[PDB]
Design a protein around this ligand. Structure first.
Ligand SMILES: C[C@H](O)c1nccn1Cc1cc(C#Cc2ccc(CCCO)cc2)on1
Ligand SMILES: [Zn+2]
Length: 295
């Protein structure tokens, strides 16, 4: 059967929050079956724990923020993307501050650390949420859509009014999340330093953790990791936001200029429409529509 997975070993990492600019220490730990992904602020006394679920998303401005009362865990999406890509069902994520570290701006450092720790299969069937009806949310010209699909696939399209320009579609049962998506970096326009550092955001942002773009070009000296890196990163963001569902998806997501707000809203509409989805397990991995890497 397709079995639940956790980490084989604990792993640690350190870095800076993109938005807050704070040094943060990160600890990923194994967790028992049906725990899901749980974030833990271990700098507070008592320790405050926020399950990574759609219901705990409190802010969606330029990142996906988990919130429980007055306590937040900011920028969960890239880490959650890495967990989903390697099929981690259960894990404690400890943090010494209010934000996941940005690392290099992509999921690469996370997938690397996870696979270094190794994966551990658990004796419980993995639960999947299967999309059985189209579910669509729109707001003005942006749209986010679930469509039934025998597998897992993400299509995205962005329309930035900028000289450097986009669309991509990836089927994750036939192409590698790691090779083709995980290295795609966070990005920001120099245009938006008015906006960002008037809202006191992106305090930790630099060329070390983001593609910086002026009116005409990428300012990073070594340029781009992929020709379509921007749209690839949006796909990475979506995978992260969709994992707040609490179970892995069988279906297709289509994004049209969507982002954190509209992705979360899709999940909330999905959850609410119980005719559009079902929980399923696979007693024989050989007949299942998706597959994962050997542990
Ligand atoms: C964090 C979220 O998941 C995300 N992924 C891609 C973009 N975004 C949104 C975003 C994007 C950003 C950003 C940014 C920025 C701007 C300027 C600089 C350097 C300027 C001179 O050294 C560095 C970084 O902040 N939030
Ligand atoms: Zn991102």
């Amino acid at each position: 059967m397709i079995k639940q997975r956790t980490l084989k070993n604990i792993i640690r990492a350190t870095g800076v929050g993109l938005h807050s600019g704070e040094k943060v220490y990160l600890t990923l730990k194994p967790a028992p079956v049906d725990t899901g992904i749980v974030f833990s602020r271990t700098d507070l006394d008592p320790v405050v724990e926020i399950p990574a679920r759609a219901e705990n998303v409190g802010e969606t401005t330029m990142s996906t923020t988990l919130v429980k009362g007055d306590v937040k865990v900011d920028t969960v999406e890239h880490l959650l993307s890495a967990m989903a890509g390697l099929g981690i069902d259960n894990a404690y994520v400890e943090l010494s501050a209010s934000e996941v570290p940005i690392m290099d701006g992509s999921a690469g450092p996370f997938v690397f650390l996870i696979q270094s720790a190794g994966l551990q299969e658990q004796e419980a069937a993995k639960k999947f949420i299967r999309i059985k009806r189209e579910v669509s949310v729109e707001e003005g010209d942006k749209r986010a859509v679930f469509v039934p699909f025998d597998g897992f696939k993400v299509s995205f399209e962005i329309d930035f009014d900028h000289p450097v320009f986009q669309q991509a579609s990836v089927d994750f049962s036939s192409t590698s999340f790691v090779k083709e998506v995980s290295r795609a970096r966070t990005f920001g326009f120099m245009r938006d330093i008015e906006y960002l550092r008037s809202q006191n955001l992106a305090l930790g942002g630099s060329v070390e953790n983001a593609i910086v773009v002026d009116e005409n070009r990428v300012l990073n000296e070594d340029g781009l990791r992929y020709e379509d890196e921007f749209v690839k990163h949006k796909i990475l963001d979506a995978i992260g936001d969709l994992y707040l569902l609490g179970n892995s998806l069988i279906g297709e997501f289509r994004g049209f200029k969507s982002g954190h707000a509209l992705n979360n809203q899709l999940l909330r509409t999905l959850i609410a429409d119980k005719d559009a989805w079902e929980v399923v397990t696979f007693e024989d991995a050989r007949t299942a529509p998706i597959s994962y890497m050997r542990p």
